Every structure is written in structure tokens, then in C-alpha cells.
Write a protein that binds this ligand. Sequence first.
Ligand SMILES: Nc1ncnc2c1ncn2[C@@H]1O[C@H](COP(=O)(O)OP(=O)(O)OP(=O)(O)O)[C@@H](O)[C@H]1O
Ligand SMILES: [Mg+2]
Ligand SMILES: [Mg+2]
Lengths: 332, 327
Amino acid sequence: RHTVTMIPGDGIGPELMLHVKSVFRHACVPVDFEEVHVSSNADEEDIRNAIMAIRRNRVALKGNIETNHNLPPSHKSRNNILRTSLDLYANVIHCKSLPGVVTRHKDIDILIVRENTEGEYSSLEHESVAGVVESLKIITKAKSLRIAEYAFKLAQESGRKKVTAVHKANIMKLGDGLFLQCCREVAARYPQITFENMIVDNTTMQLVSRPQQFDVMVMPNLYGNIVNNVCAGLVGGPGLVAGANYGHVYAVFETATRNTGKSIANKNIANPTATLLASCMMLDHLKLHSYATSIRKAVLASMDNENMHTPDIGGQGTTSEAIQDVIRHIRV
Amino acid sequence: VQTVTLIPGDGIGPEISAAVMKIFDAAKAPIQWEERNVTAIQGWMIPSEAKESMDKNKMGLKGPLKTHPSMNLLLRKTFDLYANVRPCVSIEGYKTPYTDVNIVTIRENTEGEYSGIEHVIVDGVVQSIKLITEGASKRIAEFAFEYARNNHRSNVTAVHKANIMRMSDGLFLQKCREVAESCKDIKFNEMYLDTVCLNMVQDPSQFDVLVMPNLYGDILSDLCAGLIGGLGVTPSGNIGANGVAIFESVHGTAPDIAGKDMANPTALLLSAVMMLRHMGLFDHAARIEAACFATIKDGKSLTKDLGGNAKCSDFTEEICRRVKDLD
Ligand SMILES: Nc1ncnc2c1ncn2[C@@H]1O[C@H](COP(=O)(O)OP(=O)(O)OP(=O)(O)O)[C@@H](O)[C@H]1O
Ligand SMILES: [Mg+2]
Ligand SMILES: [Mg+2]
């Protein structure tokens, strides 16, 4: 048996964690969840506990922690704090067209490797004089090489062929330019991988017209926020894609688009697909692959029935009906 | 009868600017032109033959410029063009998977992530500065709400990342909220940048007017253009200080069809239509607009970038022909 930290988070996070536990019991998964909560309070006691629990267990499954952007700058996003203190430098999501979820585009299959600790997310701002604010986007060589190393090695181990770096180095010549330059350094060690670059503006235009050109994509923090959410949209929305956060030693799994879901919480409508699929990436990371494959095939099969669809993908099914049809396919 | 500064630009530029002027002629638009090159010279400035001319006319129409500083950036600074406006509406003759787009992106154009300020903190550690000021945010927010009222738009959404960039985006969001409380007949919501991208590629009809700081507007404006067929068909205007406005193509120079009569003038034409509406020439705007739509819908004279086999002159001629029919 393994012990895994679980942070229920806010919005739809808690109810979906319960369904994760149910599926784990019915699949007899040898995993115990040790829960740590993170409240709404400005003091960092809870987030510090969660980090330390994750240090102890080295693997977590988390919902999204609400960030009230009406609080003062001193109150920082707890999601970002946890990501940065644990140094989970790679955010990885895999957006693939689901055959039973028909959208406006088909044959999408994109791996997005997003720098997850630096960039616009450094929380560095000040006011020089009254009503003049600066925010400091930070790009460094060590993190840019780290993320590019992950993206190229991932591409090669996956059988993928092309890596596209997304950037704004035509305007942010030094910041984004350094990021590009570290990508190019890594590309030199992977000559079998086609390496390309594209301006973030153009990338969005290509994504909504011909997203099939993309293979592996690597980029700094904010551009990854944007591209993750475009791609998730193209394949059917926030209820479908799992997201992984990898450090050297730690791994934290969540939904790709990091939505709290306050407006749909406690209505038995949230799509559980993304959360279940993330729990399968965690099971895979724990090397309990057989349990992962079993839950993952059930979850993907229930998606082939349009009747089990929740409203986010055009259906009218509830969360608990979908969980039932996942448990039904799990045969022992 | 008003005068407009015309900057034909480069590559296909002069061709499509001649197309626009010819179509304007067919329509008998009360508009005369004032052709003015602009080339960066030292003193880095724009040749003040044009600076003089535009300061007189106020209205300007600009083709694509080629890429040592950005000449769009010079004009931006020279006339204080602080508001970038991009109406994205689906074209019935040119179908994409998005058929019900009717969005206006309003982009703060002076500061934000385009402060021009980066520092090599230490080798291998670079900092880029995003600048948000109370004044530029207030002005862009007032522009957006007046635009919504003056073009009968119902909703204005502020797009921001104030959860992550609490002081910079939060200040921008505070100014929008302040204008929202004064112009309460326009309905106001706020939305995270990533939620806007997420929902945009799923259902763009839920969005109306969108106001945001510089980089977000730079990316979102191009995203919405991709919904409706790309930069070849997208109008654009930069509205500035002292009433000045310059309406522009945002497509490339296209130097390799530069004089082969295969350019597509639609985008500049629709920017010119936007100009006409900005000036109050609604009737001439509507007729030239409809003529271009009907031509695209037909579409025997679709230029090569719109999937047809037809030279720019054919496309241009038919629009003139059709706008002549709207009498
Ligand atoms: N598992 C899910 N199933 C269905 N919809 C989801 C899921 N997760 C997120 N969403 C939707 O994605 C969108 C963005 O998420 P966010 O956390 O901002 O939601 P919200 O603030 O509750 O939305 P609203 O603006 O409707 O109040 C929302 O429309 C939300 O309902
Ligand atoms: Mg969130
Ligand atoms: Mg752009």
C-alpha cells in the first residue's frame, strides 16, 4: 500500500475527490489518501502543512484552491505557492481528440510542456510612485533548460517528432529570447527531433484553425496557461484533460485547467473525467499501472456512450451516474 | 467632404490601397486621400511631412509596413494611439468552424508587457517589466464603455490575471470597475484570461466587448481573428490622443505577390469601413461593407488566399460593380 496526499481544494474539488475514493475502493486500489485542507485564511499555516505532507509522501492529488483576487498582494495564490516551493517545474498536459466528444476539430494530439515555477508567476510587483505598478516577469537559464530538457526527452521517449517553442521574443527580446536560446541549446542534443518556434499570437491563430500541425509544445509559464486552455477547449472543455506537475522528486496531479468550479459545485453536474484521468496518471507514477489501465479504460469507455455525458460536453448526465458507469466497467 | 491621410505601406500595400481608393470612388464616398510615405529617420522619428498631414486630417488609413525600430511603434508613440480596436464578425461567404462570432477586442496599447524595459539581472537571469498605471487603465476603460454605448454593444468583459498578478492586473481591474459603476447601462463582468481562452474556442457567441491590457489583447485579438478566417480579413483601428485615429491592415507585406495582382484587399477595405463608421459615414460604410460581403459570398472572384482562383483586380472590380448597384 501507498500513502498519497490529497488536497480537496475548493469548488468542485471536494465532491470529485469523493468519487475518486469510491472508484479506488471498488477497484481495490492499494492507496490510502491522507487529506490536508487549505482554508481561505491569509496565514500560510495550511499551505505549509500541505507542502510538508507532500514532501513526506512525494505524491499528491489535488483540486484547485480558490484565489480571491480581491485580497491584497500579500495574500498569494496557494496553488502557485505549493507549485513553486515543491519546485514542480514541469506542467504537462496531453490534449487528444476524444472520439465520443465531437467538437469543431478532429485529430488533435498535442503534448504541452509548460514551465511551472517562473515567468509571470513569480509574484514580483511594486509601486514606485502612486498609481505606477511594475510586475517582474523572470526568465532564467537554469529553469528554461530544465523545462526544455523535459520537453525534448518526453518527445523522444513518446515517439513524437516535433517540438515547438512558443514565445514573444519579437517584443520580449531578452526574456523570451533567453528562453528560446535554452530550447535551442537542448535541441542540439536531440537532432532527430524537429525543432521549431512560433509567436504565441500566431500559435493561438493556428490552434483554432489547424491544431493538427502541433506535436510537442514547450513554453514559459503564462503562455502555457493560455495554450493549455485553448487546447482543452478544442477537445471538449475543462472536464476532460488531466494535468501533471513534475519536480525532480515530487509529482502532483490535478485537472489540466485548474478550475475551482464554484458556480457548479454541489449540483452533481461536474464532469469527473479529468479528475479520474489525473488519478490514473498518479497511479501510473506510483507504478501501479494495472490499476491505472483498468480505471483509465473504464473512464474512456463511459465517454463512448453519449448518454453518460455531463452538460459540459453537451449531455445532461450527473456526476454520480458517470461514476456508476465507470464502476460498472471495472470488472474483477 | 473630408480628407484622410493614406499610408499605402509596402509589398502588396500600394496595390490594396489602390483597390480601397477605387472602391471608395465607385461608392462616391465624400473622402479624398493624401498619400504619404512614412520612413524612420533620425533627428528616430516619422518624416514630419506625414506628421503634419495626419495632425491636420486626424483620420488615417495604413497598409502593411515591412520590418531599425518598429514603425508601427513610432506611429503608436507619435500620435498617442492608446486604444487598439478589433471587431471580429464571421463572414458568410468564408466559412470557418465558428459562424456566430461578433466580438470587439479593446486592447490597451501604450504600456503593460510592452514597456520596452528588460534587464539582464545577471547572465542567465532576465527580467522583463510589465507596467500598469492608474491613468492608462482609466483611459482604456473609459474608451471601452463609451465604445460599447456608441456602437450599441450590451456587455463589456474585463480580461485579466489579477489572481496571479495582484497589483498590476488588479489595478487595471479596479479602474474598469470604477468606470463600470458610472456607465451602468453597459453591463460589466470580469473574467480570467485563461477562462476567456477556454470558453472562446468553445462558444465565442457568449462574448461581446472585451477590454484588457496590452499583451492579453495582443494575443486575444489574433485568437479571435483565427475564428473568422485570419488576418487577411480582419479590420483594425488604433484610436489616439487629439481625436486621431489610424485604421490599418495587420496582415503581412506579402512581397512575393507584391506586383502580381493577387493580393487580398478585404482587410484594409474593412478597416476603411471601420474608419467610415468612426467618421459618421454610416451609409457609405454599410454599402461598401455589403458589397464586399456579397462579393465574398458569391464567390467567383475569391482571391487565392480565400481559396479561389482570381486576381486582385477581379475581386476589386466586382466590389466596385456591386457597390455601384447599391444606389
Ligand atoms: N468538471 C467540470 N465539469 C463541467 N464544467 C466545468 C468543470 N470544471 C470547470 N467547469 C467550467 O469551466 C468554467 C471556468 O471555471 P471557473 O472556476 O472560473 O468557474 P466559475 O467561476 O464557477 O464560473 P461562472 O463564471 O459560471 O460562475 C466554468 O464555466 C465552469 O462551470
Ligand atoms: Mg482557478
Ligand atoms: Mg497580435
